[PDB]
Structure 1
Amino acid sequence: CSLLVASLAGAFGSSFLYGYNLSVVNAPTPYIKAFYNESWERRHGRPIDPDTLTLLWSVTVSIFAIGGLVGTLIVKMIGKVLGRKHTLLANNGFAISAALLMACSLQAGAFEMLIVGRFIMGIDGGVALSVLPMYLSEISPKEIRGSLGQVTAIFICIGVFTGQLLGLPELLGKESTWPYLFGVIVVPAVVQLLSLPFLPDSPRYLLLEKHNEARAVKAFQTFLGKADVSQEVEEVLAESRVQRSIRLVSVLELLRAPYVRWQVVTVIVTMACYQLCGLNAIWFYTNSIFGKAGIPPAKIPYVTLSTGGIETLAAVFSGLVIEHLGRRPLLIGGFGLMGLFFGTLTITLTLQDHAPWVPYLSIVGILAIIASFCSGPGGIPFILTGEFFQQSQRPAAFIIAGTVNWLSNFAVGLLFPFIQKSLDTYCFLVFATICITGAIYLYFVLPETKNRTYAEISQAFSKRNKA
């Protein structure tokens, strides 16, 4: 009851918006480009030559990455005081401000407004996904935590799906309706503001430093559905004592430490390959990719909808495949299948003219690419990242992984149009090479981590640390 309500509310407040804004920029792309052309003609009197327009569009699409980067560093200062629930409500405030700055951008005719709104709502994204997971884990019993991890994954997926859905030409794709594309964001924010504050805070947050015994006890009683929660309180107090008995280590000291150099290189490379694979690239430029494959323009939005649907279905299937296959074989198989399907995509795009039914092969290839992603390395890199380190929840680790995550997303978003401009019919070879290289590296380096203690994996890594 209360558990499910809180889970749905938090996910809808943060991860749903992140997924929506991940793939809401593709459907109105031609209209926004026309707006850029018109605004520049008004302001300067000279039309934009196409490469400058493509660069401006790339900046607009990819500045979300820098927004998320600065979010995943402002969260460190915010969470020390604002907690979890109030942090999510402030996140809601960013969402309101950013959505309103989006909606009024067209009529005012100042694209600077759109850029600043994108940056703010990117800060929203980085504050969202670094506060939601801890809250979701903390408000749930031990036996269900993995289920809520799959819940946040599924809500990100459904946010992407509904973003690809609302971009349909009939609903919110017309020339007189596209501003409502960044005006829908108000509703999830409003419902989150109306739902979340009527729930108890994070009990762990209330007991680690707030020391609110009665409030924490009430929160455990409400969330766990039982009045016998003293054992959990004692367990979390013991965990707090253990953590306070261990000295914290800084990011710079962690980097200078020789016994975790291989671990940090592994996590950095895993994040770089998980975000340079190009799934976010397709999510941003699905319309352009499917148009360049020879599919008639009359059906591209529907095929994009199919992409979103299969991506959500792959998430649902992964939610159970993960618990039974593993981590290292799953990651290696996912990246290798990414490479092979990128090869079949380029062999079906290079010779699209030979037969009429080749674009259908392109669609099937993209289908399988997204399925292999979302059922494979789609979610594990966010668990394995903690799993490497001995502490297993290192803020330095989550600072050194998120930085590379957001910078790689920035690189992909700002360079994919130019990659296409260079390699119209081969632009997926670069992503295929990246994916295969990542697969090779993590096959020769990363050892299996399921049902393994941190001591054994530390021993295996030290076997290569030469120390």
Structure 2
Amino acid sequence: WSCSLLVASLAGAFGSSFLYGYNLSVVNAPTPYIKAFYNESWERRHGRPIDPDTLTLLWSVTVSIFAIGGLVGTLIVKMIGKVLGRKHTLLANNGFAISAALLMACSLQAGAFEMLIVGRFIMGIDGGVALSVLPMYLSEISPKEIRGSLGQVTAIFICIGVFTGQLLGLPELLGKESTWPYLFGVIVVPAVVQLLSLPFLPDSPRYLLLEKHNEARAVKAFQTFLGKADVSQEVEEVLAESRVQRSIRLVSVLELLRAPYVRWQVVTVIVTMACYQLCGLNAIWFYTNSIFGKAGIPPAKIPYVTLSTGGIETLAAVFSGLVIEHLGRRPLLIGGFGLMGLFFGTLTITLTLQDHAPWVPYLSIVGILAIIASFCSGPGGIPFILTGEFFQQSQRPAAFIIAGTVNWLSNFAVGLLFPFIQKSLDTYCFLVFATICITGAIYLYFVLPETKNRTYAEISQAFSKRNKAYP
């Protein structure tokens, strides 16, 4: 480690990954105060009281519109990444983080509810842009000794995000009736702590050697991050990789989706990425107070019981490293989506017998904590790794658009629908996530070949038996 690599890692993550993790839990705690402002703001403009379904819809849209922001933001990186660079994107990106926080936090004074829905969208653009650039920036600057470890550092800062959003929402802090706009207005601090930190650090070495054509700056960037005298070895390596890679014909998204010699590597990334969101963990983050409310937990205690979830999330993510490498890929993706099946099952029991005894509701807490801990000691970080290990650099840039598009449309499709599933089934609503998790686990059992300590040549050979075609 070196000083510049610490601040590049931390002030990178703290303004770019943490504000994804925060933005998918900050919306939980002020739920009963925001829905109330919609009610009034729909009377003083449209001249009649808001009906319960329209109110449930405006909230379902306010929560989930973030994911359409994430989709739009992901497809903006494809175009911007050729022009600005790695460092300057994570600066210019905080145009969105600040311009979205100043929309949302003024929504109560201005009286119009559009500013909060549009604010969530532009805040989604940040979450789509900065999750796509931060992994590439970190893995371009780092010594070739830890490029594997920092995949846990982008993830732990999501969890410390979802936890901080659950802490400030306690009624001791900003989650009161009067202060709720500052839950959104505080997003300016992580953004400005990044803008007053990253500019002084070097831009990524690679970008300064393969796209901006400056060896002297590339050497300075390598010397500053690696903290050693000679870097000609990495300079030559990166140019050597480029001398190979520059010959490659890239595959287009529409062409990758159809060719037979990769068909099960595309189906197995769409089916992993769908279940990674439709397993419903984001419905547990956005709507936790509703879930614990209907479980029969005492109304006065739900803010404090909720805070445990972001805790057990963060402890799970911190200990994620020492299972992902030790167990390989196959018994984790059949493990996680298998145990989330058992725990959505037993949750549905404890929600339904919630009044057959006085102690049962507190087993619905343990049920949901085991759903969280089965995800992070498990699938939490793996699908974006597997998307890389199935494909060559010829295909991989297009594969990340398929695997990125399925992700955001699934985050949207569970964040928007959950209030309507819950209203229609009551205590049995979690049998939907039980059915999708176990369908994911039965699928990956019959398809996914092991990936740890296996070459691209071996993996592709295993899929050839069902692709029934070759390059």
Instruction: Give the TM-score of the pair, scaled to structure 2.
Output: 0.98
1:252, CA displacement in angstroms?
Answer: 1.1
Distance 1:245 1:44 in 2: 61
Residues of 2 paired with 1:166 and 1:24: CA distance? 8
SS of residue paired to 2:428? coil
Q: Aligned in 2, Cα 1:201/1:393: closer, same or farther, shift over 3 Å?
A: farther
After superposition, the C-alpha distances for 1:193-222 in whole angstroms (9 at most, x for unaligned) are 000001000001111111110000000000
Are the aligned partners of 2:274 and 2:406 in contact in 1 as well (CA < 8 Å)? yes
Contact 1:63 1:118 in 2 (8 A): yes
Between the aligned partners of 2:325 and 2:457, the Cα distance in structure 1 is 22
Does the 8 A contact of 1:66 with 1:406 survive in 2?
yes
| Cα shift readout 1:174-208 (whole Å, capped 9, x = no counterpart) | 11100001011000110100000010000011111
Distance 2:424 2:144 in 1: 51
CA contact 1:390–1:455 (8 Å) conserved in 2: no
Q: d(CA) in 2 for partners of 1:302 and 1:241?
A: 57
Deviation for aligned residue 1:261: 1.1
Question: Contact 1:390/1:458 (CA < 8 Å) preserved in 2?
Answer: no
In the alignment, is the contact (CA less than 8 A) between 1:287 and 1:300 conserved in 2? Answer: yes
Distance change >3 Å, CA 394–CA 323, structure 1 → 2: same
Cα distance in 2 for residues equivalent to 1:258 and 1:323: 31
In structure 2, distance between residues paired with 1:386 and 1:23 = 29
Q: Percent identity?
A: 100
Residue of structure 2 equivalent to 1:113? 115
Deviations 1:215-256 (A, max 9, x none): 000000000011111111111111111110111111111112
- Equivalenced residue count is 467
* Distance change in 2, residues 1:181/1:392 (3 Å): farther
Structure 1 segments of 4+ aligned residues over 4 angstroms from their partners: none
Alpha-carbon separation, structure 1, partners of 2:190 and 2:95: 12
CA 1:427–1:392: 2 relative to 1, 3 Å: farther
Residues in 1 aligned to 2:250 and 2:46: alpha-carbon distance in whole angstroms:
54
Contact 2:105 2:181 in 1 (8 A): yes
Give the one of 236, 244, 247 matched to 2:246. 244
Deviations, residues 392-445 of structure 1 (Å, cap 9, x unaligned): 871110101111101011110110000001111100000100000000001100
Structure number with higher helix proportion: 1
In 2, the alpha carbon distance for the partners of 1:428 and 1:273 equals 14
The answer to whether the 8 A contact 2:253-2:402 is kept is yes
Deviations 1:32-61 (A, max 9, x none): 000000000111121111111001100010
- Contact 1:250–1:396 at 8 Å: present in 2 too? yes
Q: Is the 8 A contact 1:318 1:375 kept in 2?
A: yes
In 2, the alpha carbon distance for the partners of 1:184 and 1:146 equals 32
1:2 counterpart (1, 4, 9): 4
Write the distance in 2 (CA, Å) between the matches of 1:450 and 1:392. 22
In the aligned structure 2, how far is the partner of 1:347 from the partner of 1:381?
A: 30
- In structure 2, the CA distance between the partners of 1:393 and 1:238, relative to structure 1 (3 Å rule), is farther
SS at match of 2:426: coil
Offset from partner CA, 1:341-376 (integer Å, 9 cap, x none): 110100111101011111110000000100000110
* Contact 2:248–2:394 (8 Å) recurs in 1: no
CA contact 1:386–1:393 (8 Å) conserved in 2:
no
Three-state SS of the structure 2 residue aligned to 1:451 is coil
Structure 1 residues without counterparts, runs of 5 or longer: none
Contact 1:251 1:400 in 2 (8 A): yes
Identify the residue that residue 230 of structure 1 maps to in structure 2: 232
The separation in 2 between residues aligned to 1:391 and 1:81, in whole angstroms, is 21
Query: 1:465 Cα shift?
Result: 1.1
Give the drift of 1:147: 1.7
What is the rounded CA distance, in whole Å, between the counterparts of 2:205 and 2:137 in structure 1?
9
Do the aligned residues in 1 keep the contact of 2:343 with 2:367 (CA within 8 Å)?
yes
Q: CA deviation at 1:391?
A: 2.7
Q: Give secondary structure in 1 for the equivalent of 2:248.
A: coil
Partner of 1:86 in structure 2?
88
**In structure 1, what is the Cα distance between the partners aligned to 2:395 and 2:327?**
24
Q: Could you tell me how far apart the structure 2 residues matched to 1:140 and 1:378 are?
A: 23
Match of 1:296 in 2: 298
Shift of residue 300 of structure 1? 0.8
Distance 1:12 1:347 in 2: 39
1:26–1:286 contact (8 Å) kept in structure 2: yes
Q: CA deviation at 1:390?
A: 2.6
> Contact 2:249 / 2:394 at 8 angstroms: preserved in 1?
no
**Unpaired runs of at least 5, structure 2:** none
CA RMSD of aligned residues (A): 0.9
Could you tell me which residue of structure 1 aligns to residue 126 of structure 2?
A: 124
Contact 2:251 2:394 in 1 (8 A): no
Retained in 2: the 8 A contact 1:138–1:204?
yes
Query: What does the per-residue CA deviation read over 1:104-135, in whole Å, with 9 as the maximum and x for residues that have no partner?
Result: 11110111111111110101100010000000
